Write a protein that binds this ligand. Structure first.
Ligand SMILES: Nc1ncnc2c1ncn2[C@@H]1O[C@H](COP(=O)(O)OP(=O)(O)O)[C@@H](O)[C@H]1O
Ligand SMILES: Nc1ncnc2c1ncn2[C@@H]1O[C@H](COP(=O)(O)OP(=O)(O)O)[C@@H](O)[C@H]1O
Ligand SMILES: Nc1ncnc2c1ncn2[C@@H]1O[C@H](COP(=O)(O)OP(=O)(O)O)[C@@H](O)[C@H]1O
Lengths: 54, 437, 93, 445, 436
């Protein structure tokens, strides 16, 4: 399956090692993924169906 | 934009259909008799009948002999082979000089082979090798796939061994040519790019065309291409090796037996109508540097049945033949060889045709020159030499450019004349000074 | 012994794995690298007897030229402890 | 079919009678009756093949026909007799000495004849049934060979199984096998089996299925020169050196062994020695070492007849500083019989020009033939022969089939001979580059 | 920079010319020869235009007048990636290559082709690697965490990346560059961890990088000849590359230029002491400049009405009349006292010499009477004499000492001519005995 960016929908070349969120590029990472509040990364992964937290 | 060399302005002989010569056509001006002689010569070459013809062009330096050779070269067209050559190039340190002359002789004879190129492009969806022993695979069934569709092929053991050479797996874009059998692996497909996040497999996209593409080509080879193809001291010319062989092969004396066998095979292919024979022109510029031994071998080799039209050019007068001591001869050509030749004379020029030459080379190199500047350049060309004016067209344009102008005026011409010196003025400076200029 | 030992000049083409595969095939040709070497004896026994490969079907081996002694086998020279005595004349005496 | 019209293509042989008496004009050779009779005598002592190592020299002025008489001798000699026509410039080589070059020419001009007896079975293979031996020794096979006409089944030994496996042969592959010698070939793949496989192999060749009888019988005669045996026996894989030319100074023991076993082969009768003619054109272009080796190397029983041509008068010999007749030392002229040619009158020039016009398909009118005859007797024969073809092209450019006097006059005007070029450069010496490297390129001083 | 000690032409950084091609009196390390500098600037603009091919220019004059200095100014002011080939005249006489084909190699080494290509490259700082070995080793999977100053990511590795990471052992804290297409990893160096050192690279991995390649036509001729690998470019055993591979290359680069994938970069060939070439090499130079893919050839010579090599006669500049007809001649003049003084001051400035004004004037006078290279050799050796007496400044007595110790040309000629019996003459007669 093709991997996509979790917040922007583009080609997700990179995935963060902390919260397992696939992001597009550097601006996306430093503006969204790093300042992301806890408890919403599972909300992002629910759309991909990997809301691991149960 | 295109580069301009010395002979870019000349396109051809500029002759009419009736054989007469127009005064200003084809990049030529004047020289009507030698142009008509070379037109008769190119009609002889296009007749494709006779072998071993020779023509010597006689005339002073800067009279347009190599211009006539290039005009002959374009008049024959790209179909007819042409091997222009300096007379100094025959003296080689790997192989003897006569064998280099005979190599150039074979180089001036060419073939045409019509062949078709059918190819298969796309992704390996399936690869099922059927063994059918009789440990040895009988055949392999490979299915290819592109954007316009898919197509299944049946392949022999040798293409399967070439596939295993290229390390082709399922999902790799390949290249298969049906006639030759070349197998080239372009890379893994784009749909298989996310199996791993990072791997060495170069992911090329799927081809947008049909899998099967067929087109026809024409292969222009010469006889010498064939003789160096099947006479290798160390074989293996077919295998692609980016790093070379461990022993460098040396150029060797190719025997008459291989020439006879290549001639027999080429005649067999022509009699089937596969190949067409196009005789060409071997042009030897500055024949006066040829040794007497090359002249003797040329005397022998102008009698062969497959020899091309040989064009020689010289500018010397009563000169000693190279390699001799007391043999004076016209144009440095020994008198036995000059009986076989047809000498065409080349005349010098005067002021008006020098002016038309200079404005043609101004027009081709797209510098705008003023009229009185052109008259000064023509007068200076008549005084010094022609090629000095031809080589000082471009610094005049440079000095006009640095003064933010597009038209060359007289002051640029005097500035270039003061900066750059001809042979006579530099010789005058050379004679007066004592300490090595 | 030579002063500098150097591998052949590496050609680097950026963006193509076919160049890497072709260069890897050229430098490390399995027929030729198998030719200048030998097969281990356990592999020969496992090949001929266990898998039933005939002896003639083995790839050709042992074609590297034999060096003159064991001393000419490699360019590295081990520091001889016998030479340590003779390095210093005071120590040798 | 590859060969084109040359300067010497009209000559088909010496125009002799059965009594060695030359006809006035036969087989393209005109005149030179004494020279043609001498060449016929040389031809007869070649064809007898009982005399070894004679040197005959052909002497004459230029444009007389020494080369023409030599290649006429070659044409009357026929095929299956070796003939080597080399210039004196081919001797001087870098990796081979001059003496070894003459030895290679001498042994390239003499050969032996070998008879073959072939029983060939040329057919398309249908099936290769293998009868696998339990021990593996003496493997049996059932070959299904099949032409268009008939098919049968053959019995095969172990080594022919090895031969058909060491080169890969399958069903539908055209081969031929000899019964007596066991030679195996692979002609390719039959054209009926071309559409089975969608992409061809790298080496796969398409040949027609054979016709007629399966097993055919034929005898072949092979003529191998002694130099080819010298090349073959020198190296392990020496047949490439027959074609690349890298022989490399074959030692004397090899040639001595080859000579003695060709002699005992003649004794037991498998081979018959066929002598030949070596034609050293322009022999004045040779060193004194070459002349000395030619003198001492003609006294062996395996030495061909040497024909040499010279247009040089009393000039110096190369490699020395003294002048000698014909440019040859007196030792070489001692072991020589000289064929002397003489120049032609206007009738012989007219007939030779007419022959060369009929050879190049040029149709000459009578007045144009007379004008070309006058130009030939004035300047030279070869200038007129070269004028014929350009006169034809000038006539064809004027939309005419035959040549008139005007086309010959225009061809004479456009192209210059040697004498007019000499006068035209002697009149203006300032424009050309002198012997001292002085020239005037300025058109106005 | 490379390996660069002080050479004879090191102070030259180009041609001291304005935008109107007017030479400054002293600029860019080069002083004097105003007409020669303007002519060389015109030739420089002719090269930079690129629309003119196969022109031959000739710099001629007395020795020690700056013809080689002018050529080195042209070479320094060309720039980078425009090819410049400098050969002496005595180099084409080879024992394994013919002279005309060596000239063909020297011609074709100076024409370059310009290809632009883009590649993806991953260059980051590795946080940690983690690879789990299998039960036996049939399949190996592992994870890889790399970072930059901006980004941070985790990668899943297949078989081939793990095999290419075990080879070239990559630890935590390394900075490596990963080529995705060719599978090539290069270790740039260890990052700033105290425990070679290179700073951590900036963000935006998988970045587009454009590398512009300039390859001479001689390399393509050696590559396209299938019997020669690229190792003939370094070992130098090409062995008379044939004409058909060259004409194939000429047509292919022509179709590349018309297709738009490449751009022809013409260059300069400089031949030192062109008078040592022979007559057939001159003939090949005459008929080789006609070609469209030919450089602009600079020849420097000082001989005047000398014999030509391989012929018996004599010709001006040691060159036959047709080659002088094919060429345009730049004449260099000699130097007066002030130009010699400024050259010596520039040379002393580059060789790090602090020298007295009177010692400078003495070296200037020795450079007026005796040729300039004698004084230029004398500065450094006088400076060594100056440090020999522990003085950091070169004085007049150091210059007098260097004059007394190291002889010039004319004094050695006189000293030989007065004592000719001690040496060996043309006939090999020598009187070694000192008395009777
Ligand atoms: N009849 C002509 N018309 C136009 N240009 C000419 C003519 N003759 C010579 N030239 C020019 O003169 C230049 C040099 O001529 P070239 O052939 O080198 O002289 P040479 O015959 O001595 O070799 C060529 O570039 C050519 O363009
Ligand atoms: N006997 C002959 N019969 C017919 N043509 C001849 C004869 N002798 C010479 N020729 C003509 O002479 C030309 C070449 O003669 P050649 O053998 O070169 O003379 P030479 O032996 O003096 O060099 C050929 O074109 C050929 O047509
Ligand atoms: N105009 C100049 N500017 C700077 N240095 C110069 C100049 N002219 C000559 N030189 C110096 O003079 C020395 C010898 O000159 P050189 O170029 O060898 O003369 P030539 O070219 O005649 O052999 C060189 O070290 C060079 O740097």
């Amino acid at each position: 399956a093709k991997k996509y960016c979790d917040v922007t929908g583009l080609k997700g070349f990179y995935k963060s090692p902390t919260n397992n969120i696939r992001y597009h590029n550097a601006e996306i990472y430093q503006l969204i993924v790093k300042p992301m509040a806890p408890g919403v990364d599972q909300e992002y992964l629910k759309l991909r169906g990997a809301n691991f937290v149960l | 934009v295109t580069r301009t060399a010395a002979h870019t302005h000349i396109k051809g002989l500029g002759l009419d259909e009736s054989g007469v010569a127009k005064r200003v056509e084809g990049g030529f001006v004047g020289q009507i008799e030698a142009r008509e002689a070379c037109g008769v010569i190119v009609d002889l070459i296009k007749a494709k009948k006779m072998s071993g013809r020779a023509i010597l062009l006689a005339g002073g330096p800067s009279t347009g002999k190599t211009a006539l050779a290039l005009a002959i070269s374009q008049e024959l067209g790209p179909k007819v082979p042409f091997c222009p050559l300096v007379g100094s190039e025959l003296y080689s340190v790997e192989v003897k000089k006569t064998e280099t002359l005979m190599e150039n002789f074979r180089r001036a004879i060419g073939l045409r082979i019509k062949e078709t190129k059918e190819v298969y492009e796309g992704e390996v969806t399936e690869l099922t090798p059927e063994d059918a022993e009789n440990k040895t695979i009988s055949h392999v069934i490979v299915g290819l796939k592109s954007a316009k569709g898919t197509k299944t092929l049946r392949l022999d053991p040798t293409i399967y061994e070439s596939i295993q050479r290229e390390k082709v797996s399922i999902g790799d874009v390949i290249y298969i040519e049906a006639n030759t059998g070349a197998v080239k692996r372009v890379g893994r497909s784009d749909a298989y790019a996310t199996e791993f996040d990072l791997e060495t497999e170069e992911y090329v996209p799927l081809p947008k065309g049909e899998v099967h593409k067929k087109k026809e080509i024409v292969q222009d080879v010469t006889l010498h291409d064939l003789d160096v193809a099947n006479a290798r001291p160390q074989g293996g010319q077919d295998v692609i090796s980016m790093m070379g062989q461990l022993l460098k092969p040396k150029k060797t004396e190719i025997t008459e037996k291989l020439r006879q066998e290549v001639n027999k095979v080429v005649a067999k292919y022509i009699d089937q109508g596969v190949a067409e024979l196009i005789p060409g022109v071997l042009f030897i510029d500055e024949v006066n540097m040829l040794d007497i031994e090359i002249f003797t071998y040329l005397n022998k080799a102008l009698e062969s049945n497959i020899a091309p039209v040989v064009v020689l050019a010289s500018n010397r007068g009563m000169t000693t033949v190279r390699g001799t001591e007391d043999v004076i001869s016209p144009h440095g050509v020994p008198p036995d060889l000059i009986d076989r030749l047809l000498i065409v004379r080349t005349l010098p020029y005067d002021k008006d045709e020098i002016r038309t030459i200079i404005e043609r080379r101004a027009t081709v190199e797209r510098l705008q020159v003023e009229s009185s500047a052109l008259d000064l350049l023509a007068t200076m060309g008549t005084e010094t030499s022609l090629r000095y004016a031809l080589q000082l067209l471009a610094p005049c344009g440079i000095l006009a450019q640095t003064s933010n102008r597009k038209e060359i005026v007289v002051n640029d011409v005097n500035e270039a004349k003061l900066l750059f010196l001809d042979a006579k003025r530099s010789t005058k400076i050379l004679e007066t000074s004592a300490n090595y200029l | 012994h030579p002063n500098v030992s150097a591998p052949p000049v590496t050609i680097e083409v950026l963006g193509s794995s076919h160049v890497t595969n072709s260069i890897n095939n050229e430098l490390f040709d399995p027929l030729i690298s198998q030719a200048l070497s030998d097969i281990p004896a356990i592999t020969q026994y496992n090949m001929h007897v266990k898998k039933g490969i005939p002896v003639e079907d083995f790839p050709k081996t042992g074609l590297f030229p034999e060096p003159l002694n064991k001393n000419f086998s490699s360019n590295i020279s081990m520091p001889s402890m016998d030479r340590f005595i003779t390095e210093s004349a005071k120590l040798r005496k | 079919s590859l060969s084109l019209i040359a300067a010497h293509s009209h000559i088909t042989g010496l125009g002799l009678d059965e009594n060695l008496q030359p006809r006035p004009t036969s087989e393209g050779m005109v005149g030179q009756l004494q020279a043609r009779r001498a060449a016929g005598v040389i031809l007869k002592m070649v064809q007898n093949g009982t005399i070894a190592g004679r040197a005959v020299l052909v002497a004459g002025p230029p444009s007389t026909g020494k080369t023409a008489l030599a290649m006429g001798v070659s044409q009357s000699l026929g095929k299956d007799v070796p003939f080597t026509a080399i210039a004196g410039s081919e001797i001087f080589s870098l990796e081979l000495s001059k003496t070894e070059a003459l030895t290679q020419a001498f042994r390239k001009s003499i050969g032996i004849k070998i008879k073959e007896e072939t029983e060939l079975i040329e057919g398309e293979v249908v099936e290769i049934q293998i009868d696998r031996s339990i021990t593996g020794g003496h493997k049996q096979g059932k070959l299904t060979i099949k032409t268009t006409d008939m098919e049968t089944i053959y019995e095969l030994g172990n080594k022919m199984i090895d031969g058909l496996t060491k080169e890969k042969v399958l069903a539908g592959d055209v081969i031929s096998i000899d019964k007596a010698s066991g030679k195996i070939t692979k002609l390719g793949r039959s054209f009926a089996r071309s559409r089975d496989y969608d992409a061809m192999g790298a080496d796969t060749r398409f040949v027609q299925c054979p016709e007629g009888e399966l097993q055919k019988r034929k005898t072949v005669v092979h003529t191998v020169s002694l130099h080819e045996i010298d090349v073959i026996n020198s190296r392990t894989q020496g047949f490439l050196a027959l074609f690349t030319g890298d022989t490399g100074e074959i030692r004397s023991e090899v040639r001595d062994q080859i000579n003695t076993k060709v002699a005992e082969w003649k004794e037991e009768g498998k081979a018959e020695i066929v002598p030949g003619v070596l034609f050293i054109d322009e022999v004045h272009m040779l060193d004194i070492e070459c002349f000395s080796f030619i003198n001492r190397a003609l006294e062996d029983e395996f030495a061909p007849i040497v024909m040499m041509a010279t247009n040089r008068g009393v000039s110096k010999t190369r490699g020395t500083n003294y002048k000698s007749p014909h440019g040859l030392p007196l030792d070489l002229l001692d072991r020589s019989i000289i064929i002397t040619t003489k120049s032609y009158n206007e009738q012989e020039i007219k007939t030779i020009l007419s022959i060369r016009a009929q050879e190049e398909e040029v149709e000459l009118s009578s007045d144009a033939l007379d004008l070309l005859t006058k130009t030939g007797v004035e300047t030279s024969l070869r200038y007129s022969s070269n004028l014929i073809s350009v006169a034809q092209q000038i006539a064809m450019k004027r939309k005419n089939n035959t040549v008139e006097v005007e086309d010959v006059k225009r061809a004479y005007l456009l192209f210059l001979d040697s004498a007019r070029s000499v006068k035209y450069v002697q009149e203006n010496e300032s424009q050309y580059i002198d012997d001292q490297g002085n020239v005037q390129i300025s058109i106005a001083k």
